[PDB]
Amino acid sequence: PTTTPLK
Ligand SMILES: *[C@H]1O[C@H](CO)[C@H](O)[C@H](O)[C@H]1NC(C)=O
Numbered sequence: 001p002t003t004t005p006l007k
Pocket residue numbers: 002003004005006
């Protein structure tokens with residue numbers, strides 16, 4: 001589970 005800096 002990984003995402004980019006908010007929007
Ligand atoms: C990426 O988005 C997810 C889902 O909102 C989480 O907030 C996660 O903490 C985010 N990653 C970063 C590096 O901000």
